[PDB]
Each structure stands twice: as structure tokens, then as C-alpha cells.
Amino acid sequence: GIPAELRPGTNQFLTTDDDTAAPILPGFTPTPTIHIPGEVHSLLELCR
Amino acid sequence: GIPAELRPGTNQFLTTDDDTAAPILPGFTPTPTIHIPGEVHSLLELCRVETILEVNNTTEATGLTRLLIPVSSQNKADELCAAFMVDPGRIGPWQSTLVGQICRYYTQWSGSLKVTFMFTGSFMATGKMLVAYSPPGSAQPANRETAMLGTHVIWDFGLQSSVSLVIPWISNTHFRTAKTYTAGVVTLWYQTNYVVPPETPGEAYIIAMGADLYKFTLKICKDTDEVTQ
Amino acid sequence: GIPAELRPGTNQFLTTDDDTAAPILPGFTPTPTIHIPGEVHSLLELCR
Amino acid sequence: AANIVLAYGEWPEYCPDKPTRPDVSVNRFYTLDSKMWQENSTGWYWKFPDVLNKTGVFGQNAQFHYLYRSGFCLHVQCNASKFHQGALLVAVIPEFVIAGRGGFTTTFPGTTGATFHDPYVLDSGVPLSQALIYPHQWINLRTNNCATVIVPYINAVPFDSAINHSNFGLIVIPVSPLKYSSGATTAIPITITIAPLNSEF
Amino acid sequence: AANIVLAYGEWPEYCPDKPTRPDVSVNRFYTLDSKMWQENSTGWYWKFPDVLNKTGVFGQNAQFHYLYRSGFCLHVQCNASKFHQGALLVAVIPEFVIAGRGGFTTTFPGTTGATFHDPYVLDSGVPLSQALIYPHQWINLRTNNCATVIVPYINAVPFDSAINHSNFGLIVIPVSPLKYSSGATTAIPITITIAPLNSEF
Amino acid sequence: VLETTINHFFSRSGLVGVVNLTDGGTDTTGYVTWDIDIMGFVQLRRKCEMFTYMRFNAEFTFVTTTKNGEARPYMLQYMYVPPGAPKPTGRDAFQWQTATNPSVFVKLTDPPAQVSVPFMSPASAYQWFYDGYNNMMGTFAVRVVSREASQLKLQTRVYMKLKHVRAWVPRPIRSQPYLLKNFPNYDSSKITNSARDRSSIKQAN
Amino acid sequence: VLETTINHFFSRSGLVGVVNLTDGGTDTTGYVTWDIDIMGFVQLRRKCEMFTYMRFNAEFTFVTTTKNGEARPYMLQYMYVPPGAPKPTGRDAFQWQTATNPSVFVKLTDPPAQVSVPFMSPASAYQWFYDGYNNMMGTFAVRVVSREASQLKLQTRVYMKLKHVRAWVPRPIRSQPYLLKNFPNYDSSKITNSARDRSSIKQAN
């Protein structure tokens, strides 16, 4: 196979890490979105 | 999945290894940079700044006196004033400089140096000094004559107040190479006797300074023998 | 992450294997080469 | 005779983008009391902005105005006869910090300034031989009696409080002690002049 | 008759880029004392630069000047009647090192040179049969009485100290012993000539 | 020429500190906190003080062993408390569950954990000389993850490595011994000297 | 034709030495240093002496076992001391914490560690013949990482592999036994001969 070497930081769970998780129920299409007024894209929108 | 095989060197932590660590707090934007004057991109930038050699190092001199090369009118022509090694990395009166200090962080160096002298006498005093460089392999000169027989500068502080001498080349090699040392000597000779008019002190000081020319280089990082802990 | 499967031949040290080792002292630039006469590129050069 | 040292090589400038940029009597020549230097002396230092905290209209603008920015023009003169011999090292140390030898007067000496105890170590615990890595000029009575240093604004934040934080300091340390034959004036004065540059409040 | 052996095939040249490149009497023909070779002999060797350390003006320039660079032109002659028979192997060994048989004279024989103890092993512990992988020439009294070898400067560093380091050596070992009918001259001289090439100091 | 660059000068991860954890149930706290300080050991301390202002990112690695050092499959938790956040007061105290404090979970038998901490200051750079009236990077805390206290004794060795270092306004190198942390005090009575002494000034060797 | 190239001739990593470590607490040093020497065993030694000058990079691998050889999860530290640097004087001595000396940390149960050492000389090449008045590559040191000494007995087997080999000025191959390291001595009294002997020169078989 492709030769590789593991590196420190292996097998660690970082609570803030950004990564992908295996979808548990693939092929499932959720309910599509409709238009709800008053979407909020930031807290600064609220602070003001 | 993709077939792979692990390889020796796996699961090892190499202190000097270059690699990426998982950012612990992603999405955090640090404070952006502003412009601060005097950024430093290399140590060589520092080594090239000349600093004071402490040539008076002795049990006798204590305070700033150790930075001063004493000179008087009591001396006679042709007799030596002061002499010292050129060894930026050894123990001696390079140990007060940046070069002397930075070299402690590296095993091997080489290049050219610069040695500048500054005379503070009375304005009306006058006389000539002989600044001479004996290269490596030879002992310090025995008298002025043999000093005049090699690289040197006749320097009259009556006219010019400061002189710069340039050691052509140095390196630290054979000491470590034979393990698997002398270098240079600079001297100060009275050409004349220090000449003085009436009612002025008749005793002065020379202030030695040293620096690395652009040619100078360093290699093989290490740690200093100075620090205790 | 990227799904992978280990394969036999893993974690083995092959004395003749061709591979890379982690440089222990990176950023170190060795002494550059000069021209020395009589370089030898093969034993056959000697046998002759 | 014009020989001038730009610290680190950057002219003082106004901050890249409202603060006030007053010049009428604000930016002008302030001259301190002169220091009388003698054979046995140690040498002196000053703290900026502190030294000006009570002066003129600047000390007033130094008051209030919790945000402060400026550069300076420092001129140092020495009046000495041709029969005096000695030398002064004039340096400028950012974030100059006096340590304990084991007070606010040491941190904020005021207009008069303060004198060193152990100049060899700068009273920072640092070798004076290396003090030359700072913007500096020699005053050697054999040649020049005056030195001039231009300091831009140097800080890690664009603005700060002039009262509670002194940005840097100025240092005159005699390296070679004053020497004179008897009958000459026994104490040589040193004059200090501060011209603010591009002050903001 | 011109038959010349370039060692490794490179003409001596000046170093790729101040050192001195003197030629007046510096580069010229130096001729040693002649070695008288006899039936029972072993053979000889020389060390360079060493052999010239005290000679002429070169030994003077060999003195001081802790950096040294040069090539050489080596000519070796043998004066023998048509009634003498024998052969000499003339070789040049870089970094030739004599070992112990279990001294500085062995390492630095000087102008006269030195003689082998066990030539079969070269007194390096190395087979003489293989000595031919070195720039070399045969002197066979049946044909040629003279050999000439050109040696460039060979070292792992562009410059070195001629005093404490001998770069290489020269070796004349009789392979076939000298033989002559009675009444002929019983000892044949060998002459050595060294011409420096592209010397630097 | 490369080895002289500031960035190469602060590289080469090394040990910035050691803390001993013990799980004694009640008698022992069962956890340890270690404040982030570059200046703990004087080697690097002397090198950071060469400059007035610096900016960089930190990379840490935790080497941990049990007494004699034999390793066993226990779970550990390294939580990072950002500046201006409360530290865990107890083994099981609720700060360990605070989501804003990032944590990493690793079995003790695994290769050591690495973490990268970015530049945390409100100012544009760190400064180890402030004349007036510091630079808190954060804190790490460690415990063993179990319901019941598992009797165990640990020491963790924190190896830190700087990245993307930038410096400003160099200083002179300290010639006097450090009396204490956080202040540049020096003995006034005894003063060490830059260079050693020799017989006479007129003699070199 | 490929197998005759100099580079292929010095390839094929092999054992350059073995050192035995024992952790006896006080009675045993608890660590080992091994200076880097190509010439320890005479197989490769005879091959390096075939050439006057050589240049290359070194690649090392550490195989380690415990006595009978069963492996257990202990942490080990291989530190590399560059030339002209002090070696550890003791198990816990402060040189182990020196950042300029690179170290690698690995659990004993893991596959062996590899390290690449570049060309270290000040000159342009290594030379094993210097006539006048060597070639220190460095040193490795090993210990067990623990607070308390863990009673254990180890041997490490160092397998080294050259890379990017270049040679100059070939030599003849030594026909006489090596008396001692670092010097080309030979017995003068007894001298081995290149070829064996036969009955008569006029007879071949």
C-alpha cells in the first residue's frame, strides 16, 4: 500500500476540532427549507 | 478504503520535526498586526552592530574602568600599550559584545571582523599610536619593529580622533577538526610619547569596539555555557 | 477523515527498503560541494 | 553642523486612520534644568512622556486625553573648554525599566530625572557594553559637544495613557570620567531640549 | 620524448574565486639529492609540500602563509647503461599515511626522503599489486629511463597549512631488483625534479 | 544563512515545564493546572528578553508517564482554559464540562497529543518589558476520566514550540543572574562581570 | 549495470553497533551513549577505506528489546548530541532538557524509530586518511522516561544506512588484518599474503 507514518496528535479527540463524521443514515433527504422571515446571521444583528 | 502500510518512524515524537498541529481554537482571528519600527529578520543584523570590547579585564579594574584602555604621558616611545586576542567565541574581552554573546549559540563561525578605536583626550593633546594585527600561528610581536613588519595602521589621534582596523579572516575549525587554537592578536604600540600642553591632564583612555562584517556567518545551533539553570 | 485500511507489510522494518526518514536537524544547510578530481561513479571504473 | 540619528530609520508620522493635532505653543522647544557633571558622577536618565507631564501647555494636554501619541526631537548639548576631556554615551531605550537592587520615583523621576547606582549594569541588570544596539550618539569633548536623536512613536498599540505608561527613556552615561587640570571649571553643564513631533491626543 | 601522465586528468588551475601568485624564482626547477639504488634496496618515498619546506624561496613562502595551494610537475630520471636491467614503479599517493609496524620522521622525512621497510605492503598495510590505481608510470631500463607526472591540487578544502599537513606523497619502489654483470657500476642514481604549478599563498 | 533567521532561532520544541498528577481519591486533588509561561526555565527566557516585542503561535505536546513509567489504557483530559476564564476548582468540578474551554481526550497508551494555540493578545504583540502600571496566554488542566478515582501517579512533560515568530526592538543580553521570575532584579552587592580576568592587559595569551 | 554504482554499493542498511541499557536506579547509570562511528565493525570499514573522500547522509533505525525480548509500554528518549556539544552525564542530568539537542520520544512497543542525519562536516567531505596533525558526526543517548527508575534491561541495535554517497580518489583494498581502530597498523612480523600458495608455478590446477 501507500507507505505512511503516524504523527503525534493521533487518536485524540479534540472537542473543538473541525472534521467530518460518518453520516449514520445516508441517502436520507431531510425536509427541504422554506422561507421563514427574520433569519439571523450574526449576534451583532441582535446587539444593535 | 485506501490500502496503506505503516512505516518505521510511526508514532514517534521528534522534537525538531516540522509539522502541523490541530488548531485548538479555530475560527478565532487574532489581533491584526500594525507597523512597529525596528523589526529584526536575522541575528546577523545584530552581530554587525559594533559594541564595546572590555579590554581592561583584570582583578584590578571594577566598574566602567574595565572598558577603558589606559594611556598616559608617562610611557616611552616604542613600548606596548595593550594587546588582546581576536576570538569572538572564546573567553576574553569579546565576552561583552553581541558577537561574543551570539557566537555562544553556534558551534562554528567564520568571516571578517571590524575593530574600531575611539580616543578621548584633551582637544589639544597629540601623539601617534601603532595599531597592528598579527595573524594566527604567530605569537604577539616582541617589539614595535616586528609589529611594523606586518599588517598595521599608523594612527595619530592629534588629527583623526578614531581609527577602524579590519581583521581579514577568522574561523573556528581545527580545534574541532583535530578533535575528530590561536587565531589573531591585536596590539597597541606607542609610536611617540603622548604629548601634552601645559595645564591639561595628560592621561586619556582608548575605547575598543568590535563588529562583524557582512561576510561573517554562523552555523550549528547550540546552547550557551553562561546560563546556570 | 479519509477512510483507509491497513495492509500486510505494516509496521515492518525492511533493511533494504527505500524510503524517507524524518530529517532530524531541518533547516541545516551542509557545507556545499567543491570540485575534487577523480570522482568515481561505478565500480566498473575500478575493475578496468 | 548637522549630524542626526533617526531611531530605527523612520520619521515620526501621524497615525494611519477624531484626535487633535495641536501646534501653536504645543510643539516647540522645551529646555530642562541643566545637569552639572563632575569627576565622580554616575550619569542620568529621563522618562518620556513623563518628564513633560507637568510642563507648559503639553503637560495640560498630557493631562486628561487618556489616549496619547507623538514622536520627539531630542538635542543634547555640553559646554566645555578645550581643556576638558571626557565622553558621554547618549542612548534611547524603549520600555526602559529600572529594577530593584535587592519605587515610583525610580519609575517616574519627573522633570529633574534620576541618577544611576550601578551604571555598568544600567541598573537593569544588563551590560552597558552592549547598550550600543540602541539609537545612540557619542558626545566626545574632543570633537562634538552636541548630539541629536529623532525618535518616532514606538509602541505595540496605536495609543496609550501618557500618565500611567512611559514609552521609553533617555540616558546620558559618562563612559570616560571628566578630567581637567586644576583651575578649570570643575563641573560641566549638560543641556536637554525636547521638541515634540506629530503629537496627538 | 614526451610521455606525460596527468593525474586524474585535470590540469592544475588557480582557485575559483587576495592570495599571492608569485612566479619569478618561485616556480622553477628544484632538483634533489640523487638516490643511489642497489641490488638490495627497498625503495623510497617523499612527502609534499613537506620536502620543500626548507628550500629556495618557496620554503620561505611555505613559511608563514598559513593558507597554501599549488600543483606540481614531477620528473624522475635514471641514468643506467644498456647492461643494467630492472624496473621502477613511480606512483603518487594522495594522503599517503605511514603506519606503525607494531614518528614525525616517518610522517615528515624532509628533503632526503625515507625508505620502506615492507614495500610489499607499502608500509600502509596495503597490497602493492594494487598500487596501480594511482597516477603512475613505469620506469623500465629496457625502454624508458625517465617518467613525468603532473599532479593537480587535490584536497577536500581549497586551502590548508603546508607545515602541518602533507597533501600527498611520491613513491619509487623497484619491482624487479637491479641486476648487472660484474664490472658495471654497482649503484644507479635516481634524480628527482619538482616544478611547482599555480602556487598560491 | 538560514539558521540565523529569527524564525529558525526560536524553533526546535523543548520542555517548558513539568507537573505531577496523582489520583488519591479524596486525599489528593486528582488533577493539576499549569499556567502557560514561557519564562519558567532560563534558557529561552534569556532569549525572549533579547527583544522588546514578539508575536507567534504556540504548539504544545504532552509526554506523560506513570512513576516507573509503564503505560496502561487510561483516559486523560487536557482542557485549555482561555485567559479570563475560571480554572477547575476540583477533580469533578463543573468547569471540566464547560464547552468554551476546549478539551482533548486521549488514551494514555497513545502517542502524545499536540495542540496549537494562536496569538492571544489584545495588543498587537507580546511585550516582556512594560514600564508603567502580564501577557496571559492561558492554562492547561489535566485529570483522569473515570467515575471512580483510579489510584495512579502521573507526571506530564509539556514540550512547547513557537511558530511564525516576529520580533522588534532588540535588547542587550542579560549579564546578571536572574533573582526571581517576572522582574529583572539583580544583586547589587555582588555583580558578575561580562568577561573573565587575565594577568596583565599587555599580555594576550 | 545498476548494482555497480557507488550509491547502490553503500546502500542496504545494516547493524553499526549495539549498546546495552539497564535501569538499576542508583547502581546502574540507567542510560547509554553511543558515539557515531562507521568503522566499528570491519565489513563496511574495509569498504570505506577504499576511497579517500566521501560525502553522504546517514539514516538510522533503533531496534530495542528487553532481555528475553518481550515488549511492554515504556517510553524511551533518543537524543542526538551534535558535534561539539556536551553529552549527558547522568540519567536525569540537565542535558536531556537541552533543546538544541534534538530528541525523539517513542513507546517501546511501537515500530522502530528512524532518523536522518545530514552531512555534518565543516570540510567539503569526510576523509578517513589525513596525513598530518576525526570526522565527528555526533552521538546518541538513550534513557527511559519516568519519574521513578523502572527496573529494566535493554539492548538497542543501531541500523544505519547511507544515502546520496559520493566518493573520490579510490584506494587499494587492505590485505592485512586490522590491529586497532582509527589507525592502519599491521603486524610487521607476520604478514598475510594476497593469494594462497600452490605446488609449482608450472602447474595450474
Q: Are C32 and G55 in contact (CB under 8 A)?
A: no
Q: Quick one: three-class SS letters along F99-160? A: CCCCEEEEECCCCCEEEEECCCCCCCCEECCCCECCCCCCEEEEEECCCCCCCEEEEEEEEE
Helical H segments across A1-48, by residue range: 44-47
**Gap between the Cα atoms of F25 and F28, Å rounded:** 6
How were these coordinates obtained?
cryo-EM
Give which of F2, F6, F9, F165 to mutate to test C binding, by max C Cβ within 10 Å. Answer: F2
B123 at interface of D, judged by CB pairs closer than 8 A: yes
**Gap between the Cα atoms of D132 and B47, Å rounded:** 12
Q: Which domain holds residue D166?
A: 1-201
Q: Are F3 and C27 in contact (CB under 8 A)?
A: yes
Query: Which contiguous run of DSSP H or E holds residue B224?
Result: none
Residue with cell 637491479: E178
**Gap between the Cα atoms of F99 and E10, Å rounded:** 73
Q: Are B183 and B86 in contact (CB under 8 A)?
A: yes
* Residue G51 with chain E: CB contacts under 8 Å: none
* Cell matching residue G115: 532518523
**Gap between the Cα atoms of B197 and B203, Å rounded:** 12
**Gap between the Cα atoms of B213 and B209, Å rounded:** 13
Residues 6+ positions from G149 with CB-CB distance below 8 Å: F68, G23, G24, G25, G26, G30, G91
How many CB atoms within 10 Å of residue C2?
7
What is the DSSP pairing of strand B170-171 with strand G126-127? Answer: unpaired
Q: Which domain holds residue B225?
A: 1-229
* Residue C7 with chain A: CB contacts under 8 Å: 1
Domain count, chain B: 1
Chains in contact with chain C (at least 3 beta-carbon pairs closer than 8 A):
A, B, E, F, G
Three-state DSSP class for residue D131: helix
C15 vs G111: CB contact, 8 Å cut-off? no
Domain count, chain F: 1
Three-state DSSP class for residue E104: helix
**Polymer length of chain B:** 229
Q: Chain centroid to CA F111: how far?
A: 20
CATH code for position D157: 2.60.120.20
Q: Which domain holds residue G169?
A: 1-205
Q: Name the DSSP class of D56.
A: T
Q: Chain centroid to CA C8: how far?
A: 24
Q: Please state, in angstroms and as integers, the Cα–Cα distance from residue D52 to each residue in D32, D105, F36, following that order.
A: 10, 15, 38
B177 vs G122: CB contact, 8 Å cut-off? yes
**Gap between the Cα atoms of A3 and D67, Å rounded:** 59
Q: Please state, in angstroms and as integers, the Cα–Cα distance from residue F81 to each residue in E113, F60, F62, F93, following that order.
A: 79, 14, 16, 14
* Residue B16 with chain G: CB contacts under 8 Å: 102
Residues 1-48 of C with CB under 8 A from A: 1, 6-7, 9-10, 19, 22
Instruction: Tell me the structure's resolution in angstroms, rounded to a single decimal.
Output: 2.7
* Cell matching residue E107: 610522517
**Gap between the Cα atoms of G178 and G184, Å rounded:** 7
Nearest to A1 among C1, C7, C19 (CB): C7
β-sheet bridge partners, residue B132:
B152, B187
Q: Are F105 and F145 in contact (CB under 8 A)?
A: yes
| Torsion sign (Cα): B88, B94, B100, B104 | positive
Q: Which amino acid is at F151?
A: Q
Q: Are D21 and D173 in contact (CB under 8 A)?
A: no
* Cell matching residue E177: 631488483
**Gap between the Cα atoms of B11 and F66, Å rounded:** 19
| Torsion sign (Cα): G22, G27, G31, G34 | negative
**Polymer length of chain A:** 48
Q: Are G156 and G62 in contact (CB under 8 A)?
A: yes
* Cell matching residue F10: 526560536
G14-43 burial by CB neighbour count: b if 16+ within 10 A, else e? eebbebebbbeeeeebbbbebebbbbbeee
D156-190 burial by CB neighbour count: b if 16+ within 10 A, else e? beebbebbebbbbbbbbbbbbbbbbbeeeeeebeb
- The C-alpha torsion from F171 through F173 and F177 to F178, rounded to 10°, is 40
F194 at interface of B, judged by CB pairs closer than 8 A: yes
Q: Are E4 and E150 in contact (CB under 8 A)?
A: yes
**Gap between the Cα atoms of E47 and E108, Å rounded:** 7
Q: Are B181 and B175 in contact (CB under 8 A)?
A: yes
Of the candidates D6, D38, D22, D44, the one whose C-alpha atom is nearest the C-alpha of residue D150 is D6
Q: Name the DSSP class of B66.
A: G
Nearest to C5 among B1, B219, B220 (CB): B1
Q: Please state, in angstroms and as integers, the Cα–Cα distance from residue E100 to each residue in D198, E104, E123, F201, G179, following that order.
A: 81, 12, 8, 46, 10
Q: Are F5 and B218 in contact (CB under 8 A)?
A: no
Q: Are G188 and E102 in contact (CB under 8 A)?
A: yes
Radius of gyration, CA atoms only, chain F: 21
**Gap between the Cα atoms of B139 and B126, Å rounded:** 30
Distance from CA of B10 to the nearest CA of C (A): 8
* Terminal alpha carbon distance of chain C: 57
A12 vs F61: CB contact, 8 Å cut-off? no
Q: Please state, in angstroms and as integers, the Cα–Cα distance from residue E201 to each residue in E60, E68, G132, G191, following that order.
A: 11, 5, 19, 43
Quick one: chain A helix, strand, coil %, rounded to 5? 10, 10, 80
**Gap between the Cα atoms of E52 and E31, Å rounded:** 11
F71 at interface of G, judged by CB pairs closer than 8 A: yes
F172 vs D100: CB contact, 8 Å cut-off? no
Q: Please state, in angstroms and as integers, the Cα–Cα distance from residue B211 to each residue in B44, B108, B208, D9, G1, following that order.
A: 11, 17, 11, 20, 55
User: With left for phi above 0 and alpha for psi between -120 and 50, is residue B109 left, alpha or beta?
Assistant: beta
**Polymer length of chain E:** 201
Q: Are G75 and G145 in contact (CB under 8 A)?
A: yes
Question: Apex CA E135: angle with CA E130 and CA E139, to 5°?
Answer: 85
| Closest chain G CA to residue F44 | G99
* Cell matching residue E157: 578544502
Of the candidates E38, E83, E88, E86, the one whose C-alpha atom is nearest the C-alpha of residue E189 is E38
Residue with cell 543501531: G158
* Residue C15 with chain B: CB contacts under 8 Å: none
CATH code for position F15: 2.60.120.20
Q: Please state, in angstroms and as integers, the Cα–Cα distance from residue E117 to each residue in E13, E103, E113, G188, following that order.
A: 36, 14, 13, 9
**Polymer length of chain C:** 48
| Torsion sign (Cα): G178, G184, G186, G191 | positive
DSSP string computed for chain G:
-GGGBHHHHS-S-EEEEEEEEEEBTBSS--EEEEE--TTSSTTHHHHHTTEEEEEEEEEEEEEEE-TT------EEEEEEE-TTSPPP-STT-GGGG-TTS-EEEEETTSPPEEEEE----SSSSEES---B------EEEEEE--SSPPPEEEEEEEEEEEEEEEEEEE-PPP-S---BTTB----SSS---SS---S-TT---
* Residue A20 with chain C: CB contacts under 8 Å: 1
- The C-alpha torsion from D48 through D51 and D52 to D53, rounded to 10°, is 100
**Gap between the Cα atoms of B87 and B91, Å rounded:** 8
* Cell matching residue D198: 506629530
Residue with cell 500486510: C8
**Gap between the Cα atoms of G168 and G190, Å rounded:** 32
F68 vs G99: CB contact, 8 Å cut-off? no
How many CB atoms within 10 Å of residue F107?
15
Q: Name the DSSP class of E188.
A: E
Residues 6+ positions from G141 with CB-CB distance below 8 Å: G31, G32, G33, G34, G78, G79, G81, G87, G88, G96
Q: Chain centroid to CA B69: how far?
A: 16
* Cell matching residue D117: 547606582
* Cell matching residue D190: 549638560
**Gap between the Cα atoms of B118 and B132, Å rounded:** 16
Distance from CA of A8 to the nearest CA of B (A): 6
Q: Are F108 and F72 in contact (CB under 8 A)?
A: yes
Q: Are B168 and G75 in contact (CB under 8 A)?
A: no
